[PDB]
Symmetry: D2
């Protein structure tokens, strides 16, 4: 109808994607793991690798093995079909008070390790 | 991937649909509003009125004017195009401890006023 | 842990609250219904009617009988034991692409009948 | 009021909790990581180990390093303060048609590997 209010659930725009490197014949190096995050981000979002790098803002190869990127919830669903993907999940603050996500910083294709 | 775990959020299978009867020139009676709930539920789900009456579990013509039925989110979306529909919303327990929804109980057309 | 990522579900900051006036002796005028919305909003937020008027942004006395205000989930929860409150639900757009909520527009007590 | 229906978002009772074993000079064996899952579960739920093992239904030391257990959202929030916890999130089906969670099956200390 003209007055219809259809419920619209809230959504998420920060997403964490983990990957499975445990079955590799030869274990990937940390930089090889990050290269694979970049390629998977581009494959899932369907953009250039340079474009995918500007969407990513953090990743880890230690505490966990995954990356974090700005994307819509609809975009996050595109990763369900990809090889090696484990968790697709909204990112949440490790420091809610300071509004900081966890992992190492990833900015402009450059990794900054964080303790 | 084979072990992908996609977070989609949880699903709702109980839906409240409220109706606007404020614009018709002839004000409807209680049983006339309930008859309109049944026909709206049938039209929106694409099923017979006899079947829609089995899906419905509560309604009101006093506290509110609307009805509640078991359906999926994909099904409830289709009510957005029907005349007179106001709110389409996941239903919630009036009495969470006893897992009770609000409104009058509706049992295949037999209606019991909630104390 | 210092690297714990606790899931933070998404939330809602626009809330629709409907009212039951069916039981009352003499049916309320539209202006009386709107005054009831302001008193209820003030009580649920724990503030004055003057302050609550600034939080409201829409209401209806026809299509539905309720008001809409900006508030958090924790604030919306405080309406649950107020007299005559029926539904407490997140507000959603009647026109999603244009980001417009439904009902009549409400700005500090001045209502604009939305055609 | 007696008719108030407060929008209850849907609640989660299946939770995934991952762990950080990356700091240890000598990495933990699979059996040591599983034993650490049981100890974390008991400590986070505030229950005995035997009671905690009853709540657990799946885990991994390979694809990911974590366990999944029945618990309320209020209970999972308590793991945010335990050492070595990384993710706390609601579990989701790897196969939505069969309603099966991922990871190896855990039944009270018995692990059945599932590919």
């Amino acid at each position: 109808g003209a007055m219809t209010v259809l419920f619209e659930g809230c959504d998420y725009n920060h997403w964490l994607i983990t990957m499975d490197f445990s079955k590799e014949e030869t274990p990937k190096s940390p930089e090889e793991m990050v290269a694979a995050y970049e390629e998977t981000c581009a494959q899932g979002l369907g953009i250039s690798v340079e474009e995918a790098k500007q969407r990513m803002y953090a990743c880890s190869t230690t505490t966990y093995q995954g990356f974090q990127a700005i994307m819509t919830e609809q975009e996050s669903e595109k990763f369900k079909d990809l090889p090696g993907v484990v968790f697709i999940l909204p990112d949440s603050y490790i420091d809610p008070q300071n509004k900081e996500y966890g992992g190492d910083k990833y900015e402009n294709g450059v990794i900054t390790h964080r303790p």
